[PDB]
């Protein structure tokens, strides 16, 4: 646990700091992919096994792939062009980032939960009846959302 | 069994647009919205729930209003891109799903499903439309991330993602705040108000009609399920109404001024959330939807890109009935007797006083009295000397729609004890 | 519990990104980071409250994919002919 | 299901693969002439301009990747039904069939519109 | 003199209205159009809300 847990958490936070700090868009996306790998390992550690594999497949494997495809079609790696820098906003921004965690830290501080449940691994074997069933309505809503998203992107690019 | 109608029409049209001209697709969309509206009415007093989808008076009323707004905004859209209709359908269905569930996650999926087609409909490709779409999408995804962490902390304070749970102390309050951020952003409550002026100014006028009516309607439909604490509600109302009216004082363009006014009006509607009466808010939103759809239908008859305040002037001489309906709308939104805006405003203030928040109510009333300055500077401008201004005096479509909106506004303002008896279970 | 605190910190980092970044795409990345932090919190509370947060995070993945698709279409349409993706380059709409 | 030891074994697999890859790259890098030249470091094609100064690449690849992310989400939803199939019966089959038909409507839309563009 | 003073009182009412408009345009200046500004003010207001809830 804590031996490798500290490692995973340190890598997670370091990768987030990179993805928000690095100006190389490609390197930021790569730090987020590393973050996704660390997070899929964490997921499996949390007895969610199917979810970690999809997190690698969809999030890293697919989403940031399209991100990279966009930033490679449109170079954009040296983002600092057309600056309007607002330099003083860089520390001020972090201030808000502090608060947005601290109050969360306050809401989660002194919070102890019963972390004892035999999830039996987050395998899809048990998620099938939960998805198609109690979640079938949310599932179909999600499917319509994606179909509409395809149509939206098509009509959005659509040079004609 | 209305959502099924919506889904069937949308999915069939998605392919039928390849064989049907965009005008035929427009007729089809209109038929679907009218059929869904009629199916909603025939189910008045018949709450129907299958899964997390749960229809009560709130779902019924707010989806009726959303369907009205969609019908009206589709009447004007005449572009030869059948997609420019399909998206509208989605939003309606999406907003339906927003008012028809208590499940926080299905609430998020419904929010995304109703909001995404708005991003694409806002592209007349005018350079301002791109800027508006960008601000809208970025701030909306930010609010969706906040709302999602709020649903997560809700699941943390309680084993279910459905509202109404007993609730813990700091963690439940924090989850409530992270939900309220997104919900007030969607309802254009300050200090989340920034996006609304820019988006209303940039988007094509009929789309702004659809937005300022149905989006705010469904947003408050979702808010009514939340048990927002009084301190947060008071802060939102104070900041929203103050900035709304004050920043509207400085506005030089009709659409931006109306967006700030809608921020102030969401601030007013946020009073009925004190009790979650769903009768006060249903009535208020009925009147607001009618009046604002009327005003934006007129503005679309003037100009889709942008309309300054001077363009409104001389409207009575140009078209008498149009100037009269515009005056009715300005006063109803001012909430002045004998117009229904007075009854909606009073019902919200009565809910607020019943909850026992007094100073907030006084500040809201002072800001509403300040609002009369520009409400009159718009309503009374109709009679002024006509200056150079593009004027498209609509088809009989938009004339009849505007007339019906104003007639319903005055009819329900004069005798509100007609429908107000049936805003509960529906006797 | 360290997992939930780390998810909050990743949300905070994404906030810092959204505020600091000049580019639209990097802001969208920071938002995705916020989403993943949310998903981690959901998985922890599902381990606590009985496995529903896993299907929750799945639907969240699908919602994320929809919004990523549509937003990247937007980013394409707005900065295809236009110059640097810098988000400060569009200041037409002023108070 | 499967024991968690297999995943630490997976970590060991990755460790050996990465170690051998880095070893091979060190072998390649250390054993070499190392006489850098200006034109040698130049990318390609005789002075400049393999592709040179060109406008941004076609959006066709963006559309490819976006299609792919959406349909991979589809597959990620189809698999939990694939594992538990006989237990979910005609109800689960019908739900998965309606879901599949929605996203197949999306596919047919993008196909009758096509992306050669 | 009382007539002049009445005119001056009406002028003070005018000044109240003008203060209202000036405050209004100071608050309408809050929205410049730089998306970073809108995001910062948004997050700032949301954090203020979350602090108020205690």
From Swiss-Prot, chain B:
It comes from the Bacteria. It is an enzyme of class 7 (translocase). GO terms for biological process: ATP synthesis coupled electron transport. It catalyses: a quinone + NADH + 5 H(+)(in) = a quinol + NAD(+) + 4 H(+)(out). The chain crosses the membrane at residues 1-21, 30-50, 57-77, 79-99, 104-124, 137-157, 172-192, 204-224, 230-250, 257-277, 280-300, 322-342, 360-380, 400-420. It is a multi-pass membrane protein. The keyword tRNA processing does not apply. It is found in: Cell inner membrane. GO terms for molecular function: NADH dehydrogenase (ubiquinone) activity; NADH:ubiquinone reductase (non-electrogenic) activity; quinone binding. One of its GO terms (cellular component) is plasma membrane. Its EC number is 7.1.1.-. Keywords: Cell inner membrane, Cell membrane, Membrane, NAD, Quinone, Translocase, Transmembrane, Transmembrane helix, Transport. PANTHER family: NADH DEHYDROGENASE (PTHR22773). Belongs to the complex I subunit 2 family. NDH-1 is composed of 15 different subunits, Nqo1 to Nqo15. The complex has a L-shaped structure, with the hydrophobic arm (subunits Nqo7, Nqo8 and Nqo10 to Nqo14) embedded in the membrane and the hydrophilic peripheral arm (subunits Nqo1 to Nqo6, Nqo9 and Nqo15) protruding into the bacterial cytoplasm. The hydrophilic domain contains all the redox centers. This is NADH-quinone oxidoreductase subunit 14.
UniProtKB/Swiss-Prot annotation, chain C:
Keywords: Cell inner membrane, Cell membrane, Membrane, NAD, Quinone, Translocase, Transmembrane, Transmembrane helix, Transport. Pfam families: Oxidored_q2. It is a multi-pass membrane protein. The chain crosses the membrane at residues 1-21, 25-45, 59-79. Its EC number is 7.1.1.-. PANTHER family: NADH DEHYDROGENASE SUBUNIT 4L-RELATED, NADH-UBIQUINONE OXIDOREDUCTASE SUBUNIT ND4L. NDH-1 is composed of 15 different subunits, Nqo1 to Nqo15. The complex has a L-shaped structure, with the hydrophobic arm (subunits Nqo7, Nqo8 and Nqo10 to Nqo14) embedded in the membrane and the hydrophilic peripheral arm (subunits Nqo1 to Nqo6, Nqo9 and Nqo15) protruding into the bacterial cytoplasm. The hydrophilic domain contains all the redox centers. This is NADH-quinone oxidoreductase subunit 11. It comes from Thermus thermophilus (strain ATCC 27634 / DSM 579 / HB8).
Swiss-Prot record, chain D:
Its main location: membrane. It catalyses: a quinone + NADH + 5 H(+)(in) = a quinol + NAD(+) + 4 H(+)(out). One of its GO terms (cellular component) is NADH dehydrogenase complex. It is a multi-pass membrane protein. The keyword Transmembrane applies. The chain crosses the membrane at residues 11-31, 59-79, 88-108. Keywords: Cell inner membrane, Cell membrane, Membrane, NAD, Quinone, Translocase, Transmembrane, Transmembrane helix, Transport. InterPro entries: NAD(P)H_OxRDtase_bac/plastid, NADH_UbQ/plastoQ_OxRdtase_su3, NDAH_ubi_oxred_su3_sf. Its EC number is 7.1.1.-. It is found in: Cell inner membrane. GO terms for molecular function: NADH dehydrogenase (ubiquinone) activity; NADH:ubiquinone reductase (non-electrogenic) activity; quinone binding. The keyword Cytoplasm does not apply. Belongs to the complex I subunit 3 family. NDH-1 shuttles electrons from NADH, via FMN and iron-sulfur (Fe-S) centers, to quinones in the respiratory chain. The immediate electron acceptor for the enzyme in this species is menaquinone. Couples the redox reaction to proton translocation (for every two electrons transferred, four hydrogen ions are translocated across the cytoplasmic membrane), and thus conserves the redox energy in a proton gradient required for the synthesis of ATP. This is NADH-quinone oxidoreductase subunit 7. The gene is nqo7.
UniProtKB/Swiss-Prot annotation, chain E:
The chain crosses the membrane at residues 33-53. Belongs to the complex I subunit 5 family. The chain holds residues 552 to 605 of 606 of the full protein. NDH-1 shuttles electrons from NADH, via FMN and iron-sulfur (Fe-S) centers, to quinones in the respiratory chain. The immediate electron acceptor for the enzyme in this species is menaquinone. Couples the redox reaction to proton translocation (for every two electrons transferred, four hydrogen ions are translocated across the cytoplasmic membrane), and thus conserves the redox energy in a proton gradient required for the synthesis of ATP. It comes from the Bacteria. NDH-1 is composed of 15 different subunits, Nqo1 to Nqo15. The complex has a L-shaped structure, with the hydrophobic arm (subunits Nqo7, Nqo8 and Nqo10 to Nqo14) embedded in the membrane and the hydrophilic peripheral arm (subunits Nqo1 to Nqo6, Nqo9 and Nqo15) protruding into the bacterial cytoplasm. The hydrophilic domain contains all the redox centers. It is found in: Cell inner membrane. This is NADH-quinone oxidoreductase subunit 12.
């Amino acid at each position: 646990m804590s031996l490798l847990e500290g490692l995973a958490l340190f890598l997670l936070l370091l990768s987030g700091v990179l993805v928000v700090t690095l100006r190389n868009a490609i390197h930021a996306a790569l730090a987020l992919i590393l973050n996704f790998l660390v997070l899929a390992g964490v997921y499996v550690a949390l007895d969610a096994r199917f979810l970690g594999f999809i997190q690698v497949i969809v999030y890293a494997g697919a989403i940031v792939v399209l991100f990279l495809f966009v930033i490679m079609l449109l170079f954009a790696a040296q983002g600092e062009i057309g600056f309007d820098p607002l330099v003083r906003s860089r520390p001020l921004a972090a201030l808000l980032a502090l608060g947005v965690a601290g109050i969360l830290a306050a809401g989660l501080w002194g919070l102890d939960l019963a972390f004892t449940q035999d999830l039996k691994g987050g395998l899809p074997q048990a998620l099938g009846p939960l998805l198609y069933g109690d979640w079938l309505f949310v599932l179909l809503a999600v499917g319509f959302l994606l179909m509409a998203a395809t149509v939206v992107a098509v009509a959005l690019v659509e040079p004609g | 069994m209305t959502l099924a109608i919506l889904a069937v029409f949308s999915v069939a049209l998605t392919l039928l647009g390849f064989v049907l001209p965009p005008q035929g697709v427009k007729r089809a969309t209109l038929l679907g919205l009218a059929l869904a509206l009629a199916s909603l009415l025939l189910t008045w007093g018949k709450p129907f729930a299958f899964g997390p989808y749960a229809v009560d008076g709130v779902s019924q009323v707010f989806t009726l209003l959303a369907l009205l707004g969609a019908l009206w905004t589709v009447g004007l859209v005449r572009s030869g891109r059948f997609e420019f209709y399909l998206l509208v359908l989605y939003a309606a269905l999406g907003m339906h799903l927003l008012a028809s569930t208590r499940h926080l996650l299905l609430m998020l999926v419904a929010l995304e499903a109703l909001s995404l087609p708005l991003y694409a409909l806002a592209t007349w490709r005018r350079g301002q439309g791109l800027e508006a779409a960008l601000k809208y999408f970025l701030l909306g995804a930010l609010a969706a991330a906040f709302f999602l962490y709020g649903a997560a902390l809700f699941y943390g304070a309680t084993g279910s993602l459905v509202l109404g749970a007993p609730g813990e102390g700091p963690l439940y309050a924090l989850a409530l705040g992270l939900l309220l951020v997104g919900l007030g952003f969607k309802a254009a409550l300050a200090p989340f108000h920034f996006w609304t002026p820019d988006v209303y100014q940039g988007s094509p006028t009929p789309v702004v009609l659809f937005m300022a009516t149905s989006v705010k309607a469904a947003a408050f439909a979702a808010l009514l399920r939340v048990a927002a604490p009084p301190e947060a509600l008071a802060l939102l109302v104070a900041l929203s109404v103050v900035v709304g009216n004050l920043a509207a004082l400085a506005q030089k363009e009709a659409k931006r001024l109306l967006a700030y006014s809608s921020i102030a009006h969401a601030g007013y509607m946020a009073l009925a959330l004190y009790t979650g009466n769903a009768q006060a808010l249903g009535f208020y939103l009925l009147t607001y939807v009618l009046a604002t759809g009327l005003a934006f239908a007129v503005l679309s008859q003037i100009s889709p890109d942008r309309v300054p305040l001077e363009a409104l002037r001389g409207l009575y001489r140009k078209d008498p009935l149009l100037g009269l309906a515009f005056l009715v709308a300005m006063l109803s939104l001012l909430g002045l007797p004998p117009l229904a805006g007075f009854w909606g405003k009073y019902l919200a203030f009565a809910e607020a006083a019943r909850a026992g928040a007094w100073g907030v109510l006084v500040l809201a009333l002072v800001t509403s009295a300040v609002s009369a300055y520009y409400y009159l500077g718009l309503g009374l401008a109709v009679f002024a000397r006509p200056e150079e201004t593009p004027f498209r005096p609509g088809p009989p479509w938009a004339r009849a729609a505007v007339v019906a909106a104003g007639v319903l506004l005055l009819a329900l303002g004069l005798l509100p004890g007609l429908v107000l008896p049936a805003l509960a279970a529906g006797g | 519990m360290s997992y939930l605190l780390t998810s909050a910190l990743l949300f905070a980092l994404g906030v810092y990104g959204v505020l600091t970044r000049r580019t639209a795409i990097l802001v969208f990345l920071s938002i995705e980071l916020m989403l993943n932090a949310a998903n981690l919190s959901l998985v922890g509370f599902a381990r606590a409250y009985g496995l529903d947060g896993q299907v929750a995070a799945l639907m969240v993945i699908a919602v994320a994919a929809a919004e990523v698709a549509v937003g990247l279409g937007l980013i394409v349409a707005i900065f295809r002919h236009r110059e640097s993706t810098a988000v400060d380059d569009l200041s037409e709409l002023r108070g | 299901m499967a024991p968690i030891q297999e995943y630490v074994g997976t970590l060991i697999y990755v460790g050996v693969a990465l170690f051998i890859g880095v070893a091979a790259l060190l072998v390649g890098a250390l054993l070499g002439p190392k006489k850098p030249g200006r034109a040698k470091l130049m990318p390609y094609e005789s002075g400049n301009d393999p592709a040179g100064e060109v406008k941004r690449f076609p959006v066709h690849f963006y559309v490819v990747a976006m299609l792919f992310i959406l349909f991979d989400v589809e597959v990620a939803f189809l698999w939990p039904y694939a594992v538990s199939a006989g237990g979910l019966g005609l109800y689960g089959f019908l739900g998965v069939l309606a879901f599949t038909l929605l996203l197949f409507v999306g596919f047919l839309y993008e196909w009758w519109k096509g992306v050669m563009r | 003199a009382l007539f002049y003073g009445d005119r001056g009182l009406l002028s003070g009412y005018f000044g109240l209205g003008g203060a209202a408009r000036s405050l209004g345009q100071g608050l309408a200046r809050l929205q410049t159009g730089y998306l970073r500004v809108y995001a910062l003010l948004f997050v700032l207001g949301a954090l203020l809300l979350l602090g108020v809830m205690r």
